[PDB]
Amino acid sequence: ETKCTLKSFTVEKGIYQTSNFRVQPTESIVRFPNITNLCPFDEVFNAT
Amino acid sequence: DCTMYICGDSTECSNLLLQYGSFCTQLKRALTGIAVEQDKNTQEVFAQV
Amino acid sequence: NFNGLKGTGVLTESNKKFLPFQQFGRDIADTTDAVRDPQTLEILDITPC
Numbered sequence: 004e005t006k007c008t009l010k011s012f013t014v015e016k017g018i019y020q021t022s023n024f025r026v027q028p029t030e031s032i033v034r035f036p037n038i039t040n041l042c043p044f045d046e047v048f049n050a051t
Numbered sequence: 052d053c054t055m056y057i058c059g060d061s062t063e064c065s066n067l068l069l070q071y072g073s074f075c076t077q078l079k080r081a082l083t084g085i086a087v088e089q090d091k092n093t094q095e096v097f098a099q100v
Numbered sequence: 101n102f103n104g105l106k107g108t109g110v111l112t113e114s115n116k117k118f119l120p121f122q123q124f125g126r127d128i129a130d131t132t133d134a135v136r137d138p139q140t141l142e143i144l145d146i147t148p149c
């Protein structure tokens with residue numbers, strides 16, 4: 004990486020910065036709110 | 052660190068930054084020029100012996 | 101995504117006390133750092149990657 008972030012092939016004696024170790028994303032999930040909003044479909048399907 | 056400040060650790064913004072190119076290497080080769088003079092300022096003020 | 105707050109990060113556990121009418125958390129950068137899950141009533145954490 005010090006051959007890659009410096010854009011050369013021969014480097015000299017020293018200390019260089021390349022990148023960091025931030026944690027990369029793996030997945031995409033979702034948690035929304037409770038519903039408590041059921042339609043009145045009991046009489047729609049279970050009327051006598 | 053450049054990508055981190057400009058882009059919030061994402062992927063779509065990290066790829067787009069390369070289109071601008073070397074706007075940032077110029078930035079971290081200046082704040083590494085400053086951050087080596089500070090180690091040089093103290094070495095010539097206190098370390099004469 | 102918690103209640104429509106899009107973001108990417110590592111979700112850990114915290115113990116911050118939030119008032120019931122006080123949902124989102126901010127910081128010096130005016131960014132969402134500590135949130136609360138909509139289905140339950142637990143404050144998750146202030147933890148990026």
Ligand SMILES: *[C@@H]1O[C@H](CO)[C@@H](O[C@@H]2O[C@H](CO)[C@@H](O)[C@H](O)[C@H]2NC(C)=O)[C@H](O)[C@H]1NC(C)=O
Binds near residue numbers: 037038139140
């Ligand atoms: C959505 O609400 C229902 C009740 O209307 C929750 O069901 C129960 O809720 C009580 C009180 O919160 C809990 O003590 C029980 O353990 C719950 N039972 C089950 C089977 O969940 C339901 O939990 C709520 N949804 C969420 C995601 O919390």
Ligand SMILES: *[C@@H]1O[C@H](CO)[C@@H](O)[C@H](O)[C@H]1NC(C)=O
Binds near residue numbers: 044
């Ligand atoms: C109608 O009755 C059946 C039989 O118990 C049940 O399975 C179904 O859930 C009922 N319909 C509704 C909308 O609850």
